[PDB]
Amino acid sequence: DIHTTAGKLADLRRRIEEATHAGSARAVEKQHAKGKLTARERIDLLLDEGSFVELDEFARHRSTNFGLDANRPYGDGVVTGYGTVDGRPVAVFSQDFTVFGGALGEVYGQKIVKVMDFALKTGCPVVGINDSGGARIQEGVASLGAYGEIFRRNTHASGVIPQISLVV
Amino acid sequence: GPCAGGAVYSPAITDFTVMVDQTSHMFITGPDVIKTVTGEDVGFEELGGARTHNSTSGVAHHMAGDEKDAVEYVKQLLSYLPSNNLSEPPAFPEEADLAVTDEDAELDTIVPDSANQPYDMHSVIEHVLDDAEFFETQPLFAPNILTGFGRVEGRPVGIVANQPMQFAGCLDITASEKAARFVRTCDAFNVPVLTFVDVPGFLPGVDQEHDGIIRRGAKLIFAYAEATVPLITVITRKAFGGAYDVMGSKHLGADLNLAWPTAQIAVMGAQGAVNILHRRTIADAGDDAEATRARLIQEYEDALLNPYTAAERGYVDAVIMPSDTRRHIVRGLRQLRTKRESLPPKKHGNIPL
Amino acid sequence: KAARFVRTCDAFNVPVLTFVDVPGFLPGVDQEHDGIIRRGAKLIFAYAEATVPLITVITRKAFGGAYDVMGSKHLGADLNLAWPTAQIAVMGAQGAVNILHRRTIADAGDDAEATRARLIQEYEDALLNPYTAAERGYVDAVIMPSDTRRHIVRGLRQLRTKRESLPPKKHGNIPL
Amino acid sequence: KAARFVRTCDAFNVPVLTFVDVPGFLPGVDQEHDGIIRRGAKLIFAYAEATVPLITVITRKAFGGAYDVMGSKHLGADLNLAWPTAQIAVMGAQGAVNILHRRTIADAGDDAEATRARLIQEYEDALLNPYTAAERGYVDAVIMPSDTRRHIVRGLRQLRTKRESLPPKKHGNIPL
């Protein structure tokens, strides 16, 4: 059912699958064709096995500009969370090119800010895996605000916690 | 033994007070003066015995059957705390096995289908703590909320959790002050705080307003917003209105906020919401005034009484399987234990009193 | 009511002047049950916590713990003044004699009463004043009621440069 | 040039006023090959790092990254003002619709062009202004140009007591 506890657990299992496969099957094919890996495969390579804990997995954008609200994929274009590398704490975000071409949006941006605040708060390195066609134009200035908030954090965290940019 | 007159204020300022049933008594004014002044007849025991101060006044944190037990209780209390605020609580590190066990699995079915049916929150708490050991404080006071200590991978943690079995787990004046002082205690002594949420809202009542729930209930939010120790919160089921903000919400500074599929995070109940949202709509067509109301209600709850709207905003960091709660707390505390945060410089705050 | 106010003044650097004429705490089962033990303790905490200048003037009564609570020097008050009419003692005359002279009153049961009436009179004339407190320095001076403004003005002039600090901590754990 | 100036002002406690009218970054293979990515970053770093009062006024053009770079609120600017003539948007109308309406324009190929022309017109009339930014609070106010001096004078009076700190570090690692 759905009004039952067991039903709610099954419903979540379904959302996980959808969230874990936000980009279409062909988009992933195109990505692999180019000789690139997916956002998640990249995290799997970097982090110690099973140490990854995803954040905002079910985040969705709040825009209605240019019918963009027709598609609100879970995660909103970027995979974020924490784990460990060689047993040491690391915060990470990985942009998903298969979703809206990886265009940075408001919620997409806040997800990154969250991973950055977590890293400054706990004192661990931040590894950013970049792969984005640019700003998500449909969102206008909201896209600009998100970038600015990231730049500010980059600056404040400068020389505090290591920041490594992986541009693939 | 006795603690009378102004002497009572010393233990009151201390962090924990443990009494022995029928041996100890605390009161500012004794029976004799109370009678020759108010004409009331009250005995020591009723006036301020161990049971009275552990379940009514809220001044004692434990009532023991004898002195040996009382001593054992303080030794325990001392084992979860550092020697001073300069260091982290004493720890005997031991890696945990994160493979999902049969006990972990029990959490997937602990929440009944009916939203009104209760379950024992003690079970949830024990399933995440080392050896399922939960050292409870103030058990007899404001039973609607649970406070106490435990260990996660050998490291002490404090717990704050609504108890569905008592007064439906509502928040009220007593539960607010009980938990508020406990939270500040853990924070002051560097003890991480884990909070589990299942709160329908605040206990309705003229008495709660007149007794000052406005300023008294505020102490709990202040406690949480002030805390700089790791804060991990798990919403198992209900989280409505202000009570949601109050129960270790991310908005107050909580570091990690998790919710079960069974969580219902919303401004208010479906009925009350539609009566306001669809007043005019429902008003139209007196003919069938009510099945449409019933329809709006069913629709409202199916759309908003879950944790997903909150998850879309990042209010909760993740919606998880109940069986994976122990996993999330273990791994969260590993990364959150290096948390460093400071408040604005001040001599001290001005928490409502 | 007072604890919060004192804490507000302290936090914002406002000196605190306190006037004392307190018989004790209100008797009643309801006060005990409603947590007088943990809620009245808030006032002593606020005063012991304060670092702003503190000047206290005892105009009349100051008995038992109430005396400690109302900005006594023991809590950290800087200047403590008492008028000639101040009565600083552990408890009322009748209560005290009934305990200290229990046997004396017992003996000579015949006309037991004007015997205690005398003890009470003698006790109040000997202890119900601010002079024993002044002997220990609990009050810095017993002053003429008319010289109160003068003392406060001159005290604040000196005390305004007061620099004190508590032990390092994230914050205190005031009873709630 | 500006990055060094901003850092100099901040280091010696001088408030910084910035007036914006930037179309974007100068296009050219040279700029890229010469490291505009790491060098243009210095200006954003200087602004994000400053703790002195920062007041910004957008008189006209503010597009894309350049908008973020010119003392934007997202970087920490305290007070952000915009004139009615301001144009705060991700990119120019032409390039935007060329991406947002690539299919709409394609369809009805016959007479494809006054369709994109209509869209361009609609796009600039709805977005190329400072009101979307104002709705989000990215600018604290859209003001009459004549009231700029008044806003800066009153802003500085309040902002001059600004106190803000950065995370402890030996120093930052600004791109060189």
Nearest to A141 among D65, D90, D171 (CB): D90
Rg (CA), chain B: 22
CB contact under 8 Å between A9 and B338, yes or no, is no
Q: Whole-angstrom Cα distance, residue B90 to residue B81?
A: 7
Residue B240, H or E segment? strand B231-240
Residue from B28, B174, B215 whose CB has the most chain C CBs within 10 Å, to mutate? B28
Question: Which has the closest alpha carbon to B348: C75, C47, C172, C54?
Answer: C172
* Chain length of chain A: 168
Experimental method: X-ray
Q: Which residues, 6+ apart, have CB-to-CB distance to C9 below 8 Å?
A: C15, C16, C50, C52
Task: Kindly state the tokens that stand for A127.
Answer: 């590894």
Name chain B's partners: 3 or more CB pairs within 8 A.
A, C
Q: Which residues, 6+ apart, have CB-to-CB distance to B297 below 8 Å?
A: B270, B271, B274
DSSP-derived pairing of the beta strands A78-85 and A53-55: antiparallel
Question: Which has the closest alpha carbon to A76: A51, A101, A52, A53?
Answer: A101
Q: Which residues, 6+ apart, have CB-to-CB distance to B104 below 8 Å?
A: B127, B323, B324, B325, B326, B327
CA neighbours within 13 Å on the CB side: how many for B99?
A: 3
Q: Please tell me the total count of domains within chain A.
A: 1
**Which positions in chain D touch A158 (Cβ < 8 Å)?**
45, 169, 172-174
Q: Determine the 3-state secondary structure of D136 from DSSP.
A: helix
CB contact under 8 Å between D173 and A158, yes or no, is yes
Q: Which residues, 6+ apart, have CB-to-CB distance to C119 below 8 Å?
A: C97, C101, C104, C105
Question: Which has the closest alpha carbon to B20: B55, B46, B49?
Answer: B49
Q: How many CB atoms lie within 10 A of CB C111?
A: 7
If you write DSSP's letter for every residue of B129-155 in order, what string do you get?
SGGG--EEESTTSSTTEEEEEEEETTE
CB contact under 8 Å between A158 and D89, yes or no, is no
Question: Which has the closest alpha carbon to B234: B127, B309, B151?
Answer: B127
**Which positions in chain A touch D166 (Cβ < 8 Å)?**
156
> Residues in chain D whose beta carbon is closer than 8 A to a beta carbon of chain A?
44-45, 48-49, 64-65, 67-68, 72-76, 88-91, 96, 99-100, 127, 132-133, 136, 138, 166-174
Question: Which has the closest alpha carbon to A154: D139, D42, D89?
Answer: D42
Q: What's A107's domain CATH number?
A: 3.90.226.10
**Resolution for this PDB entry, in angstroms:** 2.2
Task: Kindly state the tokens that stand for D77.
Answer: 């600017």
Q: Determine the 3-state secondary structure of D149 from DSSP.
A: helix
Q: Is B39 a catalytic residue?
A: no
**Angle, alpha carbons D40-D42-D43 (nearest 5°):** 80
Q: Are B156 and B189 in contact (CB under 8 A)?
A: no
Q: How many CB atoms lie within 10 A of CB B314?
A: 19
Q: How many CB atoms lie within 10 A of CB B198?
A: 26
Q: Are C169 and C69 in contact (CB under 8 A)?
A: no
Q: Whole-angstrom Cα distance, residue C117 to residue C108?
A: 14
From residue A84, give the alpha-carbon distance in Å to each of A20, A53, A126, A168, B100.
20, 10, 11, 21, 20
Task: Kindly state the tokens that stand for A89.
Answer: 């704490």
**Angle, alpha carbons C143-C148-C151 (nearest 5°):** 85
Nearest to A57 among B108, B262, B318 (CB): B318
If you write DSSP's letter for every residue of C7-76 in order, what string do you get?
HHHHHTT--EEEEEEE------HHHHHTTHHHHSHHHHHHHHH--S-EEEEEEEEEEHHHHHHTT-GGGT
- 3-state SS of chain A is CCCCHHHHHHHHHHHHHHHHCCCCHHHHHHHHHCCCCCHHHHHHHHCCCCCCEEECCCCCCCCCHHHHHHCCCCCCCEEEEEEEECCEEEEEEEECCCCHHHCECHHHHHHHHHHHHHHHHHCCCEEEEECCCCECHHHCHHHHHHHHHHHHHHHHCCCCCCEEEEEC
Name chain A's partners: 3 or more CB pairs within 8 A.
B, D
DSSP-derived pairing of the beta strands B135-137 and B145-152: antiparallel
Q: Looking at B180, B243, B263, B310, which residue is catalytic?
A: B243
Q: Which residues, 6+ apart, have CB-to-CB distance to B248 below 8 Å?
A: B160, B193, B195, B197, B224, B231, B233, B254, B257
Q: Whole-angstrom Cα distance, residue B335 to residue B318?
A: 16
Q: Whole-angstrom Cα distance, residue D14 to residue D19?
A: 16
Q: Are B232 and B192 in contact (CB under 8 A)?
A: yes
Task: Kindly state the tokens that stand for B5.
Answer: 């007159």
Q: Whole-angstrom Cα distance, residue C147 to residue C159?
A: 18
How would you class A27 by CB atoms within 10 Å of its CB: exposed for 0-12, middle for 13-18, buried for 19 or more? middle
Å from A87 to nearest chain B CA? 11
A4 CB near a chain B CB, below 8 Å?
yes
Q: Whole-angstrom Cα distance, residue B26 to residue A113?
A: 53
Q: Which residues, 6+ apart, have CB-to-CB distance to A69 below 8 Å?
A: A61, A63
Q: Whole-angstrom Cα distance, residue D176 to residue D174?
A: 6
Q: Looking at B241, B242, B253, B272, which residue is catalytic?
A: B242
Q: Are B154 and B192 in contact (CB under 8 A)?
A: no
Residue B86 dihedral angles phi and psi, to the nearest 5° = -80, -15
Question: Which has the closest alpha carbon to B138: B208, B54, B217?
Answer: B54
B225 CB near a chain C CB, below 8 Å?
no
Q: Is B5 a catalytic residue?
A: yes
Q: Any alpha helices (H) in chain B, and if so which ranges?
A: 9-13, 31-38, 44-48, 50-55, 67-79, 102-106, 121-128, 173-188, 206-210, 213-226, 241-246, 270-277, 279-283, 289-304, 308-313, 325-336
Count Cβ–Cβ pairs < 8 Å, chain A vs chain B.
77
- Greatest CA span in chain B, whole angstroms? 72
Nearest to A145 among D96, D138, D173 (CB): D138
**Cα D174 from chain centroid?**
20
B13 CB near a chain C CB, below 8 Å?
yes
Contacts of residues C120-124 at CB distance under 8 Å and 24 or more positions apart, as own/partner, are C120/C93, C120/C94, C121/C93, C123/C93, C123/C96, C123/C97, C124/C87, C124/C93
Q: Whole-angstrom Cα distance, residue B330 to residue D138?
A: 40
Q: Are C81 and C58 in contact (CB under 8 A)?
A: yes
**Cα B122 from chain centroid?**
12
Task: Kindly state the tokens that stand for A56.
Answer: 């905002």
**Cα C26 from chain centroid?**
15
**Cα B66 from chain centroid?**
28
In chain D, the domains with their CATH numbers are 1-176 (3.90.226.10)
Q: Whole-angstrom Cα distance, residue D140 to residue D152?
A: 13
Question: Which has the closest alpha carbon to D172: B303, A161, B80, B127?
Answer: A161
From residue D12, give the alpha-carbon distance in Å to each of A158, D9, D15, D18.
21, 5, 9, 17
Q: Is B272 a catalytic residue?
A: no
CB contact under 8 Å between B5 and C64, yes or no, is yes
A67 CB near a chain D CB, below 8 Å?
no
Q: Which residues, 6+ apart, have CB-to-CB distance to D1 below 8 Å?
A: none
Q: Is B349 a catalytic residue?
A: no
Q: Whole-angstrom Cα distance, residue B249 to residue B221?
A: 9
Q: Determine the 3-state secondary structure of D106 from DSSP.
A: helix
Q: Whole-angstrom Cα distance, residue D29 to residue C67?
A: 83
**Cα C11 from chain centroid?**
23
Q: Whole-angstrom Cα distance, residue D87 to residue D58?
A: 8
DSSP-derived pairing of the beta strands B155-162 and B145-152: antiparallel
**Dihedral of CA B166/B172/B173/B177: which sign?**
positive
Q: Whole-angstrom Cα distance, residue B146 to residue B201?
A: 16
Å from B326 to nearest chain A CA? 13
Question: Which has the closest alpha carbon to C47: C81, C84, C21, C73?
Answer: C73
Chain A CA closest to residue B261: A8
Q: Which domain holds residue A160?
A: 1-168
Task: Kindly state the tokens that stand for B119.
Answer: 């379950």
Å from C176 to nearest chain B CA? 6
B57 CB near a chain C CB, below 8 Å?
yes
Question: Which has the closest alpha carbon to B294: B317, B316, B275?
Answer: B275
For residues B250-281, one letter each, b for 16 or more C-beta atoms within 10 angstroms of the residue's C-beta and e for the rest, the string is bebebbbbbbbbbbbbbeebbeebbeeebeee
Question: Which has the closest alpha carbon to B351: C16, C166, C175?
Answer: C175
Q: Are D36 and D74 in contact (CB under 8 A)?
A: no
